[PDB]
């Protein structure tokens with residue numbers, strides 16, 4: 001009774017290469033999707049998503065309660081005051097179904113100047129014991145760089161789409177300083193599924209996570225093949241078809257700011273489904289001091305009545321606001 005959202009598949013492979021005309025034809029497809037529902041699937045992205053899913057499953061299904069406390073963010077473990085972002089986010093049986101593991105830039109090491117300075121939103125990742133999870137830390141760090149590479153290519157396409165040179169965003173998206181994160185979200189099957197863990201939208205739809213815009217520049221998402229996402233359009237909420245072979249891409253509210261809402265950050269939500277599944281976002285965040293001057297591609301002089309906002313300010317406020325709105329995940 002809900003209609004299907006228009007979410008085109010775009011072959012992004014030309015964004016990795018040097019065929020400028022072909023990159024422009026990709027850019028156009030990105031422009032079109034961004035102005036329509038705000039979602040598309042990136043196909044021919046080069047990443048082994050089946051192996052991602054398998055390694056992620058192995059982790060989620062083998063990590064023990066003892067380990068989850070030992071890795072827990074501050075919201076679950078007061079001993080871990082430095083873990084605001086990175087670490088384990090516990091479920092609460094009977095009340096909260098979702099659980100997840102977040103990690104940041106592998107280059108945020110104890111000697112990183114921003115870690116030394118204790119700058120907000122920068123943390124050193126926590127990992128489980130290697131002997132209990134062999135290969136996991138190395139797999140996950142490598143995945144960070146594989147999805148970083150895809151995101152750089154995507155950002156070349158968004159820049160071209162907006163009438164800019166292809167490095168317009170990508171120059172602010174750097175291995176040594178990016179605030180990008182990976183989140184490995186487990187949405188469990190539960191029998192019985194507690195009502196407490198199911199939210200209800202104003203329209204009656206049962207949800208697992210309420211409506212929101214993403215806190216990102218763009219978001220680069222892998223999910224299992226279980227339909228769950230909806231996007232608000234002018235025709236109401238529409239269902240996003242699942243595709244476990246591609247990456248679902250959308251703009252976050254930083255892109256909306258920079259573009260004066262020419263590329264809106266689409267409002268979307270997560271339907272409740274009683275299915276064991278994965279939601280594995282990569283949030284494309286810039287550096288803490290990155291500032292892009294806002295502009296408007298619908299105005300002849302390109303000028304915007306919005307003020308510049310540094311990415312670090314944006315991100316810290318955004319993540320707090322999202323927790324206030326939709327709850328601690």
Ligand SMILES: CSC[C@@H](OC(=O)[C@H](CS)NC(=O)CCC[C@H](N)C(=O)O)C(=O)O
Pocket residue numbers: 085086102180181183185209212213214215229268269270279281283319322329
């Ligand atoms: C379809 S919304 C994507 C995913 O939800 C999230 O990841 C939500 C909404 S985008 N994001 C967050 O909670 C922000 C996580 C930020 C992360 N802890 C960080 O520090 O970067 C889900 O529930 O499937």
Ligand SMILES: [Fe+2]
Pocket residue numbers: 212213214268
């Ligand atoms: Fe989201």
